[PDB]
Write a protein that binds this ligand. Sequence first.
Ligand SMILES: [Zn+2]
Ligand SMILES: [Zn+2]
Ligand SMILES: [Zn+2]
Lengths: 46, 114, 266, 65, 134
Amino acid sequence: ATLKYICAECSSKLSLSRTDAVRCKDCGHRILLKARTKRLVQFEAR
Amino acid sequence: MNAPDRFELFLLGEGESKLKIDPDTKAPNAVVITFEKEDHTLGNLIRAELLNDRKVLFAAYKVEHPFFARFKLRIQTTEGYDPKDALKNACNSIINKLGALKTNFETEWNLQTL
Amino acid sequence: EEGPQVKIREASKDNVDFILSNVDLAMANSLRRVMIAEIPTLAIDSVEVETNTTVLADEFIAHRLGLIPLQSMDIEQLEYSRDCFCEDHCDKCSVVLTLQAFGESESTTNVYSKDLVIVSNLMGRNIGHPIIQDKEGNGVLICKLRKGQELKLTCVAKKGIAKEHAKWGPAAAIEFEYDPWNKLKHTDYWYEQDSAKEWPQSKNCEYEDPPNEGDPFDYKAQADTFYMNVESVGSIPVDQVVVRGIDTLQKKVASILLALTQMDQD
Amino acid sequence: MIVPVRCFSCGKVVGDKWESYLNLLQEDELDEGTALSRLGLKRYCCRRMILTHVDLIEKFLRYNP
Amino acid sequence: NQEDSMIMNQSSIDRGLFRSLFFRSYMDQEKKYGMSITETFEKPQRTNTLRMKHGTYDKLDDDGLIAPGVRVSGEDVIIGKTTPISSKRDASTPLRSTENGIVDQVLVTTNQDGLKFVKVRVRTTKIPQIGDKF
Ligand SMILES: [Zn+2]
Ligand SMILES: [Zn+2]
Ligand SMILES: [Zn+2]
């Protein structure tokens, strides 16, 4: 539910510490993406 | 970015009244009604109706800049006729004209089947 | 009935063809403007996006949602939130719709205007049900999703006039022609060798008496009798477009009449 | 990039006629013009709207994540 | 519409005529030299650091990255990197002064050399305004 990152190759929910380097645990591939804020954005449908 | 809010087109601002009636500096018995938050939907209609009043000498309207929803109506009437009245009468005449039209269209619509 | 005369030739669920006899150009035109702009309607004016894993941008989706036509029948018994007392919106000024769709099927999943859901208590008002004229029952196609994708969002539909955003138009096109014989000589037809053979004559030529070739020009004639066709988008039925058209125009004249009376005191 | 809702010029709702349009061409074996007309798309501004539309969404969907 | 000017139907525009998306992808990397000497990606505070931007860093998470979905404007610090001095002096990236948008995506990858490096993209809808060239 409460993550930090997501692998771009295998669309997989992840989360790791900068003390534990980079890359996907159960995929390999070194990519990674930040994942949407739960902050919630409101748009004028204009 | 430097554009105004689209409601500035129909919403009156800080203070700001709809009609500002100012006496004409030049010719007598004439006046300049500045209609705030208005276009050609109202300008032309009031103007053309005023031109039917066979006691109104002059009646014209202009929209000085397109950026702004605001128009200037100039009215000149015969001695012993306040232009404020000439407008009042014009306005009234339009409501009545439109009244009939609603009633008529309504009538005809009911007779139509689809 | 006394003044201006209406003669409906054709009428449908979303189209009315008629003639407007005994009227001034200004009135005919002003009606056409008020029908385009100044009539209030309900439209999504706030999308709150929880999830969006579609190929489309959040705002790109929000934009389409605004354009989606929805019931504006009992729209006169919904308030402009601007003049409502609530902090933000409520039930007296807004309609709250929901959209949750998840591409679950192996095939492409289509999101329709049919898939929006009212969550606001309507208080028995005919309002904000996405208007669906489509044969198959689906609305407007909003989005598409692959097997993976999900789109979770909330919509606040609000009262507004086309004059603020084109989405609020109960509008569509309005046909408008007067004097299909140019008897008025109200336009000078451009030609190479012949004005008559080169310009195609109107559907409305049947309804008028063709000129008179070797006859004097009617200098005193005033443009009257207007051939019109009003198309509804669907939010408000056709009869109501013109009835509310007449009405709102009549209203703004009355506010200008009432305006005079306030300056009259001091 | 998905069939716009409403024609830019006039406003007639076009965002619902799309799939319908494709059946007329594919299944019903109709021609573009007649199919456009069959959908009630009379004016040229409404005609172009669907006729010149390129539905890239189909292509984007194709991408794996 | 005189002298190479043109009139647009504002109505058409609201309906989606000539509307476009604009994407600007900002980027940075942790250090370029030093065997123990590295820069850092984190939201920085008062920490004897002093020499900093502001535009508020306050939209950054602990990783020194904005989460995708936040609206960004002005000089909003979008990446929070820091240079260590033998005291954390700034090295943080503000969003392009003139710009404003919504964070579209943030990519956290490594280099051939094995260094933390980020790519931050920002989305903006550009609507046909006044002196827009066609
Ligand atoms: Zn992976
Ligand atoms: Zn309210
Ligand atoms: Zn059209």
